[PDB]
């Protein structure tokens, strides 16, 4: 992708005690324009893994085809084996760096959540091929505004519960809706545990403007 | 002799006898059964036991292609599941080209014509392989296809294929298949093919069962082990 | 598929090959050609063999090619495989011509199309050419010349050669009657017309069944003349004439 | 009648793998023979007329300069093994700055060895030994038209294999020394031969740990023949 | 456009002993003006005597790794032995060679033992050149540690001072103390100082924390 | 015979020819026996040579480090599908970065091995694997055939004399799922002393074993390692 | 493509189609060639020739190099193209290591290239034997064969084609040291053996020397005139 | 970067620095630039230090196969013309490479100089590199055919020691080999810091 | 430019049954000459010539793939080829380089032979033809050849008063012309006989 098109924004992450929370906006922006503002930006990969995205939306719903396909023959061989978030993290960094080689990247910037086997995972996946876990992940503008946000918490208290993560990440895309030219107040939250992997609906923020009666 | 040798040449009265004599493998692998009922389609594959040594759960004769399409082969089986091979990555073209889950009377379509493209060279054998093609769509019911090793599908309501072809549908007509669900139907697939198999020639034998429909909300899947167990219930009762 | 391949390559086991030598049977029946050289000028006789009364006699020639502006050729056997190896050496003289802006010496011009039909003789698995001929031309560094191919694929040079249906018998009468440097473009005709009254058995030389080009030296033309159908006949009792003279007179 | 290169046997062998064995049953004799101090190897030549030059053939060949060979059945195809060893050892010396094992030689030309077909045309009818020090000491490897290869200690290949083995196998014991497996191999290539034993009809060399691949010539050689 | 690179930061460092090698590098990966993790080191164990750096382009970093770690297991199913640290540093130049006219943006230090059980030390270009040297420094502040390094180890430009060995204990709290200052001066010089340590017995492993600026 | 020569025709009873005869190939090497207990996987090999002197042809081969194999036939195509299978392991932990499941790499073999047995001109692959690995679901043991039939099984033993070597894993079956590693072994032991003749049975240079287990790499061992799992059998009743 | 083995073994172990090139090699014109300390002599017999005819255009002695000459025997069709494909390698040679090409590596260009040609699909083998004569560098004159196999072999003299071993036993018991003295005494070495062979009457012999220095020389027909003249007057006088 | 390189009549005298920069960082001072291709063959470094590690390395690959077909080692002339023809292949691709091979032939020493454009010239004496014209003026004036041993490798021994006086990008320590008949030999290694006492004095 | 590089100036002129071309000698290099006797028209059969002019590389080269392509085509048929056919010919050889152009611009000439008709005609780089009536210029002095040819031909004219009129359009305008010179070659045809003559130009 030369020139990405209809772009996303910034999407968090952050483990808490058993299970990953993941939430990202409902806007494609186009320039600055907001053309489309009812789309999903988070797939519910199948059962313990979870992945949301940024960068140009053209190529999501081409990795959104692609990953779809690899799921679905696996589960039909039978085996009782199924792709760990980190084989797909593995994997879909295997397709970043092979990509950029060919001077043709895909415009994306990745975010892989996972709760497999008792434990939580939580991946990055670059553009350029650049992967790396954290207990807090954050794109875009996000890592300038949000991901301080993420740390001097996760410093202070490093295991979180469900209702702490929870709420610390509306915190977190509150602030993204007032310092952020391509947000939108129309968000959905993801959660994988060992249940399974839920997407919770258009949630909304709250805001705050009092300081405006301030001349 | 000489005209039965490769599968380019007809013979003095006009047929290919490469194709027949791919089409007499078929009847040494043992039978596979399958019938559709008013929602569903039920496949059934009794399977041999040769040796102690081999493991319960072994070289299945019965594949699963598609999310919803079910696969339950008789033949040769390294050809059987190198032609499941071909059809599990046909449906893939598919939905990535056209976007949704492939449709029966197109995947048999597509299948039937690679299966005949070897009925034509000398390059290249036929296969020794028969099977069935069944499913349940929301839009379009039970699909119940069954392709020959000369590449030749029609629809059924209940097919046989294997050893004893003849008298496994000779007793499935005795059914009724247009009225009855998908539950009783696992124990009368059962049935019939107890009948079948007298113990001289076979001394223990494997039963397993294959189901699909909306009772199992669309996804092919294996039977329960109680479903199947009330079926090996419904076994011994045929002495009578 | 292996029983169907018919293995036109391999040896046979006293040796020789024999798919080359069905073709040399082949070539011995069919047509007459013969060339003559001692001095300034070379010919080519050749016999016509489809003498019907019903034909255009068109195309300035029937079994002569010209190949370059100062050679020609004059070809026995499959005349349909002929057609093929006629417009393959035409362009051979030309891509030398393209690469060296001077025309190609007539010898090498025969080693050149004579690789391409040993090729077939030996890998492929594929039927040889049933064709040879004969090569006439001119050059600055030898003059004028005279050659031969065979369908296996090695030439010779020459000064009188047939590869007749009875061209044994004309080789014999050559080698009976010739003169090494002294045969001039007159008596040269003379012999030939002599030669193919031999090997003709349809007697009394009808001057339609026979041919005759000559290729002669002018200056910077060396003008290759096919000539016509109006001074055989007199050059066809010329030889009779003397033959009555020489039987009478002893 | 015919059938193709590439068949079964109701045996189950193969067809023209079975027969390139009996094609080195033509072959000059050889014999090698593993020694602790190094490994000795030699050959006959099968000098054939008068006027002929002796030491134009030869069937010990150096691979690299600790690795020997020698060949036999026939000697036009084993050209193009022994190039294909070369080019294996400088190419391993290229990347990994070392000297390729005598295992590892073996298995890069028996891969090469069956290989023929109908697309992309026979086996080779050679049979090889393999002398050589590696960092495991003096090493003797086998290999065969099949591709099997396999270490002996005293392998005797040719015209005279068999004849050779029985009396082979009588004199080898695991504690020999270099100076009686030369000796006691020549003792074995008199009886086999057809003509008298002299420095022409036959060849030695012997790799060391010390030193590097030695061939024999015509004047160190006959001490061993005139104290036989 | 889309450019191919970038610049993430690393130092990692290496010193050949007598009989062992000492491996370290700092746990900061990051990129423009930012951090991303605080834990993520290079002491990379290839086998029990052979550790490896990989400092520049990340990318290329991860996929170098997995790359030399495929053609280890591809040298023993074909040899039968593992192989030495001269193997490793002369097989991995002609690795960075081959892709010549598109090159990777690795810094590259191997530190392990040889066959006679002393130290070894090769330093690499991104193209691939190498030597063996007693001690390199690769990486952001790679230009802080190597003067520092021609004192102590080198014993450069010292009158009248002796010549002893490296000793295990006086190399350890040496390497300490270097990365300190080079926290202090340096920005993408990070938080925990990873060593690892090869011995005739085996990989020992450290971590010793920094500054967190 | 004139059914009898390419592995296109068909036979008029309906079987190819070819495909049979190569399974006369796998039934000259010599033996080896492969089971499982709960928690291991263990495949005895049985050694053969030429002359007395020469070395003894080694069988058991290592692809990775949960997966190793088992030859019987001609070794050349042996080292073909074996180049093939250590290829197919270490990309698939080049890419995923995950152990390559053993029931998922034996349906590669057996799309590998179809496809000479249906053009014009092509040979099976005359070869015997017996295959020990780990899954996330513990041991497996496989055999495949060169009429590229996979099995599943819990042991099985192929081989020059192999079905005096079955009879006994069927009267035995029922206690192997239960013992340790030491007498798991030396029930397969007790299976290659079934398959000789009655005078040469054990002795240290001849037999191999390999042991992949659950906490437990594959390891090989050979003619010396051997003798401490090779002592502590009784003698042959006679 | 003509994709098919045409060379594959015997049930005894031979090689059918190249024992069947080998009776090829052995109807074709005799060559014999033999080496002197200073000056080779090597000569076709059999020129059979019409007598009447042109003969620049049938010579079987050419010259790879202005150090090698080389003469055969065999079927001539597949003989003059091996010549041409040595004539393109050894001139690439010098594009290459400065040197002139030595006679050691010319014979094994055209040995390897026989011996991969009876490998291949669907060709059958070369039907030539060769000798190659070169005096290289240093000076040192030696010469070689070449068997439709690809087996490249030196000798001190040697004789091919139809009637060679009549001439190879008769070489053997003819070859003494002192033959070998005098320039035109070698070359009396080779007309009694060509006289010992098919007719060979001084107008079916053709031979050619060369003086290590020198291209190949052919005499006319007035020194072999001259030599079969004292050579049979030798033998009249001495029986 | 200084190499030099003369032949006289005891064989070749070849000489080099040991400084490789990295911009105006010095990357190492122990860089040998003289590397050994064969027992009888050498090879020097400038430029490309890769691109003349690698392509020489494949040139000892290439002349060891010549060895072993041969049965005679290669001529310095003919190993001066494979290396120069497998550097045009990549002509404008960007290699830097500017190497001399010297080495004891059959018609008695050789010395040549290869270039990455395709200069393949012999000659008596040369130098190259970025101080390489530093070399010549103080090599031309100490150089005659007839030198003795010891007067030889005073004259290339100093020669360095000038050009690393005045050149920034040259330094460290002054190698120093001899080819002879049989093959080359190691002379010393001196510092040039150890020189520079020895030469005001 | 690129056409600039070697100069050069071709003119065919029509004239009553009878046709003449001319052509320019020089060769150089932008500002220096090399020769004075350059070939720039070449014979393509009797009573029937071409003219090429441009890049000295590409005169030398369509004059050659051409006769390449002439030989064969007068030997597969027996008759020599037409003029409004050799047209057809140069134009497909030159539209094959569409986008690898040969740069050069030809001008053909001569009479037909059966019916001894004049013939003109000219192409630019990629294989336009344009026929006309009264005359065809190609080069660098384009330009002025026009105000020559414009001002001086007449419909129906002897073959004397077309040489002095077509030396008169040569001399005077590539005397105009700075890279073109050094002399003047005119080759007039007419069904008898050929007439090659040499013009007293300014050697300056």
Same mark, same amino acid.
């Given at each position: ?215 | ?240 | ?250 | ?228 | ?9 690393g130092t990692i460092l290496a010193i050949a002993g007598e009989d062992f090698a000492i491996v370290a590098s700092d ?26 750096g990989?400092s ?51 810094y590259?230090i191997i530190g ?6 002393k130290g070894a030390v090769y330093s ?7 030597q063996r040297d007693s001690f390199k420094a690769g990486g952001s502040a790679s230009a802080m540690l190597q003067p520092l390094l021609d004192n102590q180890v080198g014993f450069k430009n010292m009158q009248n001072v002796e010549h002893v060995p490296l000793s295990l204990d006086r190399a350890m709290r040496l390497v300490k103390d270097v990365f300190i200052s080079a926290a202090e001066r340096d920005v993408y010089t990070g938080?925990?100082l990873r060593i690892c340590i090869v ?7 450290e971590?010793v924390?920094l500054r967190?600026? | ?238 | ?162 009637? +060679?071993?009549?001439? !190879?036993?008769?070489?053997? /018991?003819?070859?003494?040291? &002192?033959? %070998? *003295?005098?320039?035109?005494?070698? #070359? ?19 031979? +050619?020397?060369?003086? !290590?220095?020198?291209?190949? /020389?052919?005499?006319?027909? &007035?020194? %072999? *005139?001259?030599?079969?003249?004292? #050579? ?8 | ?16 620095d040991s400084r490789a920069t990295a911009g105006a960082y010095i990357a190492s001072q122990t860089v040998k ?131 690393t006086?005045?050149?920034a990008y040259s330094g460290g320590a002054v ?14 290694s001196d510092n040039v810091a150890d020189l520079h006492e020895?030469?005001?004095? | ?204």
């Open positions: 992708t030369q020139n990405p098109m209809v772009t996303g924004t910034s999407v968090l992450g952050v483990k808490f005690e058993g299970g990953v929370v993941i939430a990202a906006d409902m806007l494609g922006s186009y320039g600055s324009l907001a053309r489309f503002r009812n789309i999903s930006r988070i797939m519910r990969v199948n059962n313990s893994t979870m992945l949301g995205a940024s960068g140009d939306y053209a190529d999501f719903q081409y990795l959104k085809q692609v990953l779809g396909q690899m799921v679905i023959d696996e589960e039909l061989l039978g085996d009782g084996h199924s792709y760990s978030p980190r084989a797909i993290h593995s994997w879909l960094t295997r397709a970043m760096y092979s990509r950029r080689s060919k001077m043709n990247p895909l415009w994306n910037t990745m975010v892989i959540g996972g709760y497999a086997d008792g434990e939580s995972f939580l991946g990055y996946v670059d553009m350029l091929g650049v992967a790396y876990e954290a207990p807090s992940l954050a794109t875009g503008y996000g890592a300038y505004l949000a991901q301080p946000l993420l740390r001097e918490v996760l410093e202070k208290q490093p295991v979180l519960s469900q209702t702490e993560a929870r709420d610390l990440v509306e915190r977190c895309m509150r602030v993204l809706y007032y310092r952020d030219a391509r947000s939108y107040n129309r968000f959905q939250i993801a959660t994988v545990t060992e249940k399974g992997v839920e997407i919770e609906g258009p949630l909304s923020t709250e805001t705050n403007w009092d300081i405006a009666h301030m001349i | 002799t000489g005209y039965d040798l490769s599968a380019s040449t007809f013979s003095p009265d006009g047929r290919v006898f490469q194709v027949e004599y791919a089409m007499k493998a078929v009847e040494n692998s043992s039978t596979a059964i399958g019938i559709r009922c008013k929602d569903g389609v039920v496949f059934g594959v009794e399977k041999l036991v040769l040796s102690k040594l081999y493991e319960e759960g072994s070289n299945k004769r019965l594949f699963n292609v598609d999310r919803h399409v079910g696969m339950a082969v008789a033949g040769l089986l390294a050809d059987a599941r190198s032609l499941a091979d071909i059809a599990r990555e046909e449906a893939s073209n598919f939905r990535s080209n056209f976007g949704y889950n492939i449709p029966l009377k197109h995947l048999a379509d597509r299948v039937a014509m690679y299966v005949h493209a070897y009925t034509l060279y000398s390059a290249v054998r036929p296969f020794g392989c028969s099977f069935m093609l069944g499913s349940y769509s929301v839009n379009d019911g039970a699909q119940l296809y069954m392709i020959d090793p000369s590449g030749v599908s029609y629809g059924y309501w209940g097919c046989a294929i294997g050893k004893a072809r003849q008298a496994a549908k000779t007793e499935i007509e005795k059914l009724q298949m247009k009225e009855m669900t998908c539950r009783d139907i696992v124990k009368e697939v059962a049935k019939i093919i107890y009948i079948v198999h007298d113990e001289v020639k076979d001394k223990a034998f494997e039963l397993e069962l294959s189901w699909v429909g909306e009772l199992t909300n669309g996804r092919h899947e294996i039977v329960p082990k109680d479903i199947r167990e009330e079926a090996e219930k419904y076994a011994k009762e045929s002495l009578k | 598929s292996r029983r169907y391949d018919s293995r036109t390559t391999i040896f046979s086991p006293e040796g020789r090959l024999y798919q080359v030598e069905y073709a040399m049977e082949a070539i011995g029946h069919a047509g007459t050609c013969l060339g003559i050289l001692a001095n300034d000028g070379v010919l080519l006789a050749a016999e016509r063999r489809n003498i019907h009364k019903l034909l255009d006699e068109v195309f300035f020639s029937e079994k002569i090619y010209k190949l370059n502006e100062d050679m020609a050729c004059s070809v026995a056997g499959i005349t349909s495989d002929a057609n093929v190896l006629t417009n393959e050496l035409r362009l051979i003289a030309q891509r030398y011509l393209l690469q060296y802006q001077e025309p190609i010496p007539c010898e090498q011009l025969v080693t050149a199309l004579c690789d391409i039909k040993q090729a077939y003789t030996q890998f492929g698995g594929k039927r040889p050419f049933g064709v040879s001929l004969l090569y006439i031309g001119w050059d600055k560094h030898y003059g004028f010349q005279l050659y031969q191919s065979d369908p296996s694929g090695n030439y010779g040079g020459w000064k009188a050669t047939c590869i007749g249906n009875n061209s044994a018998a004309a080789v014999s009468m050559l080698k009976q009657d010739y003169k090494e440097g002294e045969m001039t473009l007159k008596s040269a005709l003379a012999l030939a017309i002599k030669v193919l009254n031999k090997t003709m058995d349809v007697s009394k030389l009808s001057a339609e069944k026979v041919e005759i080009a000559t290729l002669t030296r002018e200056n910077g033309k060396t003008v290759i003349r096919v000539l016509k159908q109006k001074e055989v006949e007199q050059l066809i009792k010329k030889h009779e004439e003397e033959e009555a003279k020489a039987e009478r007179e002893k | 009648y015919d059938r193709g290169v590439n068949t079964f046997s109701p045996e189950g062998r193969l067809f023209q793998v079975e027969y390139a064995i009996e094609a080195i049953k033509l072959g000059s004799t050889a014999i090698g023979i593993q020694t602790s101090e190094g490994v000795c190897l030699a050959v006959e030549k099968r000098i054939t007329s008068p006027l002929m030059e002796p030491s134009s053939i030869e069937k010990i060949v150096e691979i690299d300069a600790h690795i020997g060979c020698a060949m036999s059945g026939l000697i036009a195809d084993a050209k193009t093994l022994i190039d294909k060893a070369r080019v294996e050892t400088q190419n391993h010396w290229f990347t990994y700055n070392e000297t390729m094992t005598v295992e590892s030689v073996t298995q890069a030309v028996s891969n090469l060895a069956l290989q023929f077909g109908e697309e992309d045309s026979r086996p080779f009818g050679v049979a090889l030994l393999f002398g050589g020090v590696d960092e495991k000491g003096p090493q003797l490897f086998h290999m065969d038209p099949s591709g099997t290869f396999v270490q002996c200690d005293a392998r005797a290949i040719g015209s005279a294999s068999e004849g050779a083995q029985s009396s082979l196998q009588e004199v080898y014991h695991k504690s020999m020394t270099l100076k009686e497996a030369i000796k006691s191999s020549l003792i074995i290539l008199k009886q086999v031969m057809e003509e008298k034993l002299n420095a022409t009809n036959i060849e030695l060399a012997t790799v060391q740990p010390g030193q590097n691949f030695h061939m024999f010539t015509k004047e160190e050689l006959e001490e061993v023949i005139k104290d036989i | 456009r889309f450019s191919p690179y970038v610049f993430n930061g746990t900061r990966l990051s990129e423009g003006f930012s951090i991303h993790t605080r834990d993520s080191p290079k002491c990379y164990k290839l086998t029990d005597k052979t550790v490896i990989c520049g382009f990340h990318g290329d970093c991860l996929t170098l790794t997995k790359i030399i770690e495929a053609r280890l297991k591809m040298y023993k199913h074909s040899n039968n032995k593992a192989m030495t640290t001269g193997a490793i540093a002369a097989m991995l130049s002609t690795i960075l060679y081959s892709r010549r006219f598109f090159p990777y943006y690795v590259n392990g033992l040889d066959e006679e059980g690499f270009d991104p193209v691939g050149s190498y938080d925990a011995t005739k017995e085996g990989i020992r492993e971590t924390s967190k600026d | 015979n004139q059914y009898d020569n390419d592995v296109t025709v068909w036979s008029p009873q309906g079987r190819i020819h070819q495909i049979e005869y190569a399974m006369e190939a796998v039934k000259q090497g010599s033996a080896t026996v492969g089971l499982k207990s709960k928690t291991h996987a263990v495949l005895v090999a049985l050694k053969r040579a030429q002359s007395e002197l020469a070395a003894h042809q080694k069988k058991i081969l290592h692809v990775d480090n949960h997966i190793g194999i088992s030859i019987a036939g001609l070794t050349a195509d042996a080292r073909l599908l074996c180049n093939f299978m250590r290829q197919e392991c270490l990309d698939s932990r080049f890419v995923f970065d995950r152990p390559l499941p053993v029931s998922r790499l034996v349906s590669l073999i057996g799309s590998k091995t179809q496809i000479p047995t249906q053009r014009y001109g092509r040979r099976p692959y005359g070869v015997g694997l017996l295959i020990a690995g780990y899954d996330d679901m513990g041991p497996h043991i496989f055999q495949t055939c060169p009429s590229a039939n996979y099995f599943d099984c819990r042991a099985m033993s192929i081989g020059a004399r192999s079905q005096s070597a079955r009879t006994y894993l069927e009267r035995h079956m029922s206690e192997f799922m239960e013992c340790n590693l030491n007498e798991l072994v030396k029930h397969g032991l007790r299976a290659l002393r079934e398959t000789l003749p009655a005078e040469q049975d054990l002795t240290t240079k001849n037999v191999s074993i390999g042991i992949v287990g659950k906490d437990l790499e594959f390891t090989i061992y050979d003619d010396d390692d051997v003798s401490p799992f090779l002592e502590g059998l009784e003698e042959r009743p006679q | 493509s003509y994709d098919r083995a045409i060379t594959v073994f015997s049930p005894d172990g031979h090689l059918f189609q190249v024992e069947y090139a080998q009776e090829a090699v052995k109807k074709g014109s005799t060559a014999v060639g033999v080496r002197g300390r200073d000056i080779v002599v090597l000569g076709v017999e059999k020129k059979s020739v019409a007598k009447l005819q042109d003969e620049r255009t049938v010579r079987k002695i050419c010259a790879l190099d202005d150090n090698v000459c080389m003469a055969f025997a065999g079927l001539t069709a597949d003989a003059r193209i091996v010549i041409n494909r040595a004539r393109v390698e050894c001139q690439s040679h010098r594009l290459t290591v400065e040197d002139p090409v030595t006679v050691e590596y010319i014979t094994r260009y055209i040995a390897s290239l026989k011996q991969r040609y009876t490998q291949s699909n669907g060709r059958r083998p070369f039907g030539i034997s060769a000798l190659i004569v070169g005096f290289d560098f240093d000076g040192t004159p030696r010469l070689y064969q070449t068997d439709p196999s690809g087996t490249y072999h030196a000798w001190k003299a040697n004789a091919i084609g139809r009637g +060679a071993k009549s001439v !190879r036993e008769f070489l053997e /018991k003819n070859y003494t040291d &002192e033959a %070998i *003295e005098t320039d035109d005494l070698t #070359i009396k070495l080779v007309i009694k053996a060509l006289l010992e062979v098919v007719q060979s009457g001084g107008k079916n012999i053709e031979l +050619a020397v060369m003086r !290590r220095d020198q291209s190949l /020389k052919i005499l006319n027909p &007035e020194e %072999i *005139e001259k030599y079969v003249a004292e #050579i049979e007057k030798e033998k009249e006088e001495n029986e | 970067t200084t190499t030099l390189a003369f032949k006289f009549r005891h064989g070749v005298i070849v000489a080099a630039k003289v590397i050994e291709i064969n027992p009888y063959l050498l090879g020097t470094m400038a430029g490309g230090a890769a691109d003349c590690s690698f392509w020489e390395r494949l040139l000892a690959r290439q002349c060891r196969i010549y060895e072993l077909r041969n049965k005679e080692r290669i001529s310095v002339a003919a190993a001066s013309k494979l290396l120069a023809n497998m550097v045009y292949q990549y002509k404008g691709m960007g290699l830097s490479m500017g190497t001399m091979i010297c080495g004891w032939d059959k018609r008695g020493p050789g010395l040549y100089y290869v270039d990455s454009e395709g200069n393949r010239i012999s000659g008596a004496t040369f130098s190259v590199g970025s101080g390489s014209v530093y070399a010549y003026g103080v090599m031309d004036r100490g150089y005659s055919y007839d030198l003795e041993v010891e007067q030889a490798y005073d004259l290339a021994r100093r020669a360095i020691y000038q050009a006086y005045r050149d190698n120093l080999y001899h080819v002879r008949e049989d093959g080359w030999i190691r002379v010393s020895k030469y005001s004095g | 430019s690129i056409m600039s590089y070697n100069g050069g100036a071709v003119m065919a002129m029509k004239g009553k049954n009878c046709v003449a071309i001319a052509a320019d000698r020089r060769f150089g290099i932008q500002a220096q000459m090399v020769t004075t006797d350059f070939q720039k028209i070449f014979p393509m059969g009797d009573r029937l010539y071409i003219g090429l002019a441009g890049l000295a590389t590409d005169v030398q080269t369509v004059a050659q793939r051409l006769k390449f392509r002439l030989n064969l085509y007068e030997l597969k048929e027996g008759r020599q080829i037409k003029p409004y056919t050799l047209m057809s010919m140069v134009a497909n050889l030159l539209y094959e380089k569409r986008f690898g152009p040969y740069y050069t611009e030809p001008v053909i000439a001569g009479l037909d032979p059966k019916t001894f008709k004049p013939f003109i005609c000219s192409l630019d780089l990629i294989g336009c033809p344009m026929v006309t009536d009264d005359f065809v210029v190609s080069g660098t002095c384009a330009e002025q050849m026009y105000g020559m040819c414009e001002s001086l031909w007449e419909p129906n004219m002897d073959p004397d008063h077309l040489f002095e009129t077509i030396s008169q359009a040569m001399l005077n305008a590539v005397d105009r012309d700075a890279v073109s010179g050094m002399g003047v070659i005119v080759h007039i045809i007419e069904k008898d006989k050929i007439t090659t003559r040499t013009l007293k130009a300014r050697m300056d």
